[PDB]
Amino acid sequence: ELEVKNMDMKPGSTLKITGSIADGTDGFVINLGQGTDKLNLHFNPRFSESTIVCNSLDGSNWGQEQREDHLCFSPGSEVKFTVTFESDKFKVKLPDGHELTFPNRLGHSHLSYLSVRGGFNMSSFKLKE
Amino acid sequence: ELEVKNMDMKPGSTLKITGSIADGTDGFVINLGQGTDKLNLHFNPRFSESTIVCNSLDGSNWGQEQREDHLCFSPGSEVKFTVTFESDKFKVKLPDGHELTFPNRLGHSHLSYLSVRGGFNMSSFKLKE
Ligand SMILES: OC[C@H]1O[C@@H](O[C@H]2[C@H](O)[C@@H](O)[C@H](O)O[C@@H]2CO)[C@H](O)[C@@H](O)[C@H]1O
Ligand SMILES: OC[C@H]1O[C@@H](O[C@H]2[C@H](O)[C@@H](O)[C@H](O)O[C@@H]2CO)[C@H](O)[C@@H](O)[C@H]1O
């Protein structure tokens, strides 16, 4: 339920998130955007469905749902995701090395809100230039 | 206006902040507390007065002000602060190992709100128990 607010994530920067995935959890959520009603990227690993459902949020309506069946990490372990923001798109680097890519459909050249929902408890985040 | 809402900082754990002091600023603030109304530790380095002002704020009530002139850093530099929360006091470890201490006046055994004002651009946040 943690929520970082008013950060300055410009294009080219890299956000490094390390946290722990609660035992026996269905999944979790990492939201990046301008605010709660505007999520440029909604990274959501569903252990239940065995997928990483990524999607965007523009107020009330979600965008087309994209899915990646490359859930190669487990609960009980503390892992790290490295998502690098780029005007054109985001590249999330999964803990097992596999890079993902989600489009910046909302045209936002600046992120400022992050929120950790679900069974993930992040111990630290690092914003690189 | 940067604010980390919803953290789970209990006594014993340690927050480890890192950032850049904006060139030309007169100071910056790091608030640790229950919210905007309740601040258990208001950490404020004044380059304009060359001290570090520490105080507590119970909604409207600002406690007795503490001033520590061990302000051995300047703007344009990257500093590191380590805040250990003992339920009885806050111990702030300055960039140069010098340790400060501020009594937990509001008697809380949990901190869930961080906020940064002033000319400090935060790059790291690590919280571990
Ligand atoms: O799209 C991300 C969004 O999905 C919601 O659930 C979807 C579900 O993934 C989809 O298969 C179904 O058709 O619609 C549901 C929404 O009504 C989640 O509830 C939400 O948290 C996001 O993860
Ligand atoms: O106690 C922290 C608190 O300080 C206020 O500033 C004081 C200042 O310390 C004092 O020298 C001056 O005489 O009065 C000011 C206002 O009462 C800040 O206004 C407040 O934001 C905190 O930083």
UniProtKB/Swiss-Prot annotation, chains A, B:
Binding residues for a beta-D-galactoside:
62-68
Question: Where would I find the Galectin domain in this sequence?
Answer: 1-128
**GO cellular component entries:** galectin complex
GO biological-process terms attached to the record: cell-cell adhesion; positive regulation of apoptotic process; positive regulation of inflammatory response; T cell homeostasis
Q: Which Gene3D superfamilies match?
A: 2.60.120.200
GO molecular function term, any single one: galactoside binding
Organismal lineage = Eukaryota, Metazoa, Chordata, Craniata, Vertebrata
Species source reads Homo sapiens
Q: Which InterPro entries match?
A: ConA-like_dom_sf, Galectin-like, Galectin_CRD
Q: How does it assemble?
A: Homodimer.
What does the UniProt keyword field contain?
Answer: Lectin
Physiological role = This protein binds beta-galactoside. Its physiological function is not yet known.
Mutating residue 129 to Q: effect?
In a breast cancer sample; somatic mutation
Q: Name one Pfam family in it.
A: Gal-bind_lectin
SUPFAM superfamilies per the record?
Concanavalin A-like lectins/glucanases
Q: What is this protein called?
A: Galectin-2
- What gene name is listed for this protein? LGALS2
- Keyword match Cell membrane: no
